[PDB]
Amino acid sequence: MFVDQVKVYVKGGDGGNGMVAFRREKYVPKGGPAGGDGGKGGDVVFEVDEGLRTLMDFRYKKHFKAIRGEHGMSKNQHGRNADDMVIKVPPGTVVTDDDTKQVIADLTEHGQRAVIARGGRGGRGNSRFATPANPAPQLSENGEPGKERYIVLELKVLADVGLVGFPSVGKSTLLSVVSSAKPKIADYHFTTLVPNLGMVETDDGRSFVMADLPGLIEGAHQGVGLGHQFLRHIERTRVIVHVIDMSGLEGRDPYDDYLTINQELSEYNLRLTERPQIIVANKMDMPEAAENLEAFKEKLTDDYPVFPISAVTREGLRELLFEVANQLENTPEFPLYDEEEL
Ligand SMILES: [Mg+2]
Ligand SMILES: [Mg+2]
């Protein structure tokens, strides 16, 4: 029900211009065409790479231009075909022309690639235009221009990390601070459920989709067959970032809230207790918060890494997102049933 969309400009290589030359040896004479042909320009090619999860790259650079083919040379030596510009895109990416509004490619398998903007053919040299009434032609072909087109990339968005914890703890303000961008809804204006999810971006290029688990879970409990959708979506979210409070404007006992939340999770019987977790001790800027984490760290018996941060900032969360990313690359999906049907 959520999809990311980005428009960019792609252009294939123009392709080398043919040459105009002649064999000029010290044979007391001169003549005979020798201009080599041009090489084809390169293609802008999209390739699927499961390692990717968001179209966040196409946001910092929306201009992809392939290299031009090689120009023809004398000695009838032709130019080689320029290498293509391969651009890695997430699985399930649909590419359409922002004009002919057509589907250029529907990339879905890893390694699956498609020609997005093809490069022009190389221009033929003079050696090609020689006829009996033109033994020494001065005609040459310039390279065929690489096609340029404005495209839009569409992607079906599915959460990767889930946010749990008491309300007002920060799950919302947090998911918002790191939320470099939010998806669009394609079922808009009815159930208006709209779980709270967003695409965050680390500082090393990596990126992923984060959401507030409760919202997803509550949608997986709707009737008239509307839960299945959210069930699948939950199998997708592989990491859990637990946010506890270390102060308590009206709350008390940190390790307590940790127990309360982790229990509910296991009660939904969805395997949310198997999913890796990353505790986030927030509100660390408070007095009591200093020693609370001291005790909390002790009582904690799990292997889950604790990331304490003060003032939810886009920078002070640098080391957090990083872990989320690393963990995310070492954790498998959580399907309810395996491939044991036979
Ligand atoms: Mg960065
Ligand atoms: Mg249902």
E-strand ranges in 55-196 read 63-65, 85-89, 93-97, 103-107, 113-117, 148-156, 161-164, 179-181, 184-185
**What whole-number distance in Å separates Cα of residue 219 and Cα of residue 2?**
14
Distance of CA 219 from the midpoint of ligand 1 (Å):
33
**What CA–CA distance (Å, rounded) separates 230 from 323?**
26
- If we measure between CA atoms, which residue out of 52, 32, 242, 257 comes closest to residue 137? 32
- 176 annotated to a ligand binding site: no
The annotation status of 193 as a binding-site residue, yes or no, is: yes
Q: Are strands 2-11 and 184-185 parallel, antiparallel or unpaired?
A: antiparallel
Whole-Å CA distances, 121 to 19, 81, 86, 124, 287 = 14, 9, 19, 9, 70
As a whole number of angstroms, the distance between CA 141 and CA 118 comes to 19
Is residue 43 within 8 A of residue 115, CB to CB? The reply is yes
| Terminal-residue alpha carbon distance, the chain | 32
Report the C-alpha gap between 215 and 221 in whole angstroms: 10
Q: How far apart are CA 241 and CA 15, in angstroms?
A: 51
CA distances from 305 to 107, 207, 242 (A): 36, 20, 10
Residue 103 Cα to ligand 1 midpoint, Å, equals 32
Task: Kindly state the DSSP code that residue 257 receives in the 8-state scheme.
Answer: H
Residue 159 Cα to ligand 1 midpoint, Å, equals 21
Ligand with the closest atom to the CA of 229: 2
Query: Could you tell me if 170 and 224 are in contact, meaning their C-beta atoms sit under 8 angstroms apart?
Result: no
Query: Is 22 assigned to a binding site?
Result: no
CA angle 42, 149, 39 (to 5 degrees): 20
- Specify the residue for token string 């390790």: 255
Q: How many DSSP H helices and E strands does the chain contain? A: 6, 15
Q: Report how far residue 231's alpha carbon sits from residue 335's, in angstroms, rounded to the nearest whole number.
A: 9
**Residue whose entry in the numeric block shows the structure tokens 């879905």:** 108
Distance, CA of 237 to CA of 297 (rounded, Å): 26
Which SS3 state, helix, strand or coil, does residue 222 take?
Answer: coil
DSSP label at residue 173: H
Cα 266 to middle of ligand 2, angstroms: 20
Instruction: Please tell me whether residue 13 adopts helix, strand or coil conformation.
Output: coil
Q: Based on C-alpha coordinates, what's the Rg of the chain?
A: 29
Cα(269)–Cα(275) distance, rounded to whole angstroms? 12
Residues pairing with 282 in the sheet: 245
The two three-digit tokens of residue 49, written as one number: 């790479």
HEC readout, 75-113: CCCCCCCCCCEEEEECCCEEEEECCCCCEEEEECCCCCE
Length of the chain counted residue by residue: 342
User: Cα separation of 49 and 207, whole Å?
Assistant: 13
What is the phi-psi region of residue 165: left when phi exceeds 0, alpha when psi lies from -120 to 50, beta otherwise? left
Pull the structure tokens for residue 292.
């609370």
Residue with tokens 């083919």: 69
Helix (H, G, I), strand (E, B) or coil at 130: coil
d(CA 58, CA 89): 9
Tokens, residue 311: 């003032």
Q: What is the DSSP letter of 224?
A: T
Q: How far is CA 91 from the centre of its chain?
A: 9
Is 292 annotated in a binding site? The answer is: no
Cβ–Cβ < 8 Å for 14, 120: yes
CA of 270 to the centre of ligand 2 (A): 15
**Distance separating alpha carbons of residues 27 and 172, to the nearest angstrom:** 84
108 is in an annotated binding site: no
Task: Measure the CA–CA gap between 313 and 293, rounded to whole angstroms.
Answer: 20
61-64: list long-range contacts, CB under 8 Å, 24+ apart.
61/8, 62/6, 62/7, 62/8, 62/9, 63/8, 63/9, 64/8, 64/9, 64/10, 64/11, 64/117
CA–CA dist 153, 35 (Å, integer) = 42
Q: Experimental method used, please?
A: X-ray
Residues 6+ apart with CB under 8 A from 106: 94, 95
Q: What is the DSSP track for 260-296? A: HHHHHHHHT-SSTTTS-B-BEEE-TTSTTHHHHHHHH
257 CA to centre of ligand 2 in angstroms? 30
Give Cβ neighbours of residue 163 (< 8 Å, ≥ 6 apart): 171, 174, 175, 210, 211, 212, 213, 240, 241, 243
Q: How far is the CA of 227 from the centre of ligand 2 (A)?
A: 4
Strands of the sheet with 85-89, listed across from one edge: 85-89, 44-48, 113-117
Contact 249, 255 (CB under 8 A): no
Amino acid symbol at 1 = M
| Distance in Å, CA 335 to ligand 2 centroid | 17
Distance 206 CA to ligand 1 centre (A): 9
Cβ proximity of 115 and 47 under 8 Å: no
Q: How far apart are CA 317 and CA 255, in angstroms?
A: 22
Q: Which ligand sits nearest to residue 60's alpha carbon? A: 1
169 is in an annotated binding site: yes
Domains along the chain? 2-157 (2.70.210.12), 158-342 (3.40.50.300)
CA 4, CA 157: separation in Å to the nearest integer? 6
Structure tokens, 164:
């749990």
From residue 6, give the alpha-carbon distance in Å to each of 96, 111, 288.
11, 21, 46
